[PDB]
Amino acid sequence: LSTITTHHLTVPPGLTPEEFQELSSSIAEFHSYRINPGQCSSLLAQRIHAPVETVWTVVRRFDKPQTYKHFIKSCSVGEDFRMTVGSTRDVTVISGLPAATSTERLDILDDDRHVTGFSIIGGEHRLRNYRSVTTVHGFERDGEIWTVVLESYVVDVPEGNTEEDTRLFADTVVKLNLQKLASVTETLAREAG
Amino acid sequence: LSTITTHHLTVPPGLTPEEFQELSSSIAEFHSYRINPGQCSSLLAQRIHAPVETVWTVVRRFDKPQTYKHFIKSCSVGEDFRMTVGSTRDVTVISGLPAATSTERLDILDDDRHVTGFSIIGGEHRLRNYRSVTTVHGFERDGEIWTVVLESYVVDVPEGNTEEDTRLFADTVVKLNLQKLASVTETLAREAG
């Protein structure tokens, strides 16, 4: 029947064991899912050489996912958009197939603890019933500072797919976007203001 | 009816006008196509801070495209593979759909002038009748050296797609792979041997 994900019990790719020991409680709190047959879930991590609030300024921009995500043609949120849970955005995906809008809802926004998350509620692409959470975490060693971003998701495995058909694809895209986030925010850090 | 591509008459993205003036003849020679209704073609460029032969060692590895390309699960070339024109590779794509092999044929391999190219001859994905050429070029200024890689393609626009539905997708993937090529070969350069 249903199971609970175990992302909080092993070191995810891109994280060191030292860093995992610090984040184990956070992974249990925000990156645990109850999962059924026909779904898959994964946790991805990315180290960034920038301060936490620099990274968070980009991660929290629900109306501009294209700032750090690939394969987005445009993103629209209409007239009276405010950054509040329950809001939606219309993402036009670069798919190589006809025009496809992904309607996505903001599920979480915590500026104090640096957690956000969203749900794909409509759209004919390869990520049905997709739901994901992103959290941002600061680290220090001998005066040096860095950030770790954790991003997890749950998603449907389409009939005819193997779980790995879907997990490898979703992992590749999330990982590519985190690499872009790292590049964009490290550049922001190097240039300051 | 048919037309000739004009990649050699404008500065492609990622190239400076100075660099274009040097490559104009090469773009005409290796990156020109005759194109019909229902096809699209593009030219992409990527600057790399590494010597030409360092970049070429990776670009020419027809049996290991995953060294610099994303979304490749595996690549197989069988028992008696030799790096000669006419050889084929079986690429398993990360698509988020069921298992899909891309059979690809090596069309060009010129180690003196640093040109290669391949054709997708079979495979149920979004790049039907795909054909591409990659060329590598060295630059110098006041003792500093760099490389420019040019990569162009022609591909079918599926029925039901607009040309931009296909061109934006193909451009995004080629551009992402060139960014990976840059990272991989700049790392190789920094570490020498």
Ligand SMILES: O=C(O)/C=C/c1ccc(O)cc1
């Ligand atoms: O390629 C697909 O099937 C879906 C891609 C996708 C990319 C960005 C999104 O916000 C949603 C879906």
Ligand SMILES: O=C(O)/C=C/c1ccc(O)cc1
């Ligand atoms: O996503 C697709 O439809 C096709 C992808 C692709 C990626 C690498 C290849 O070598 C061929 C096709």
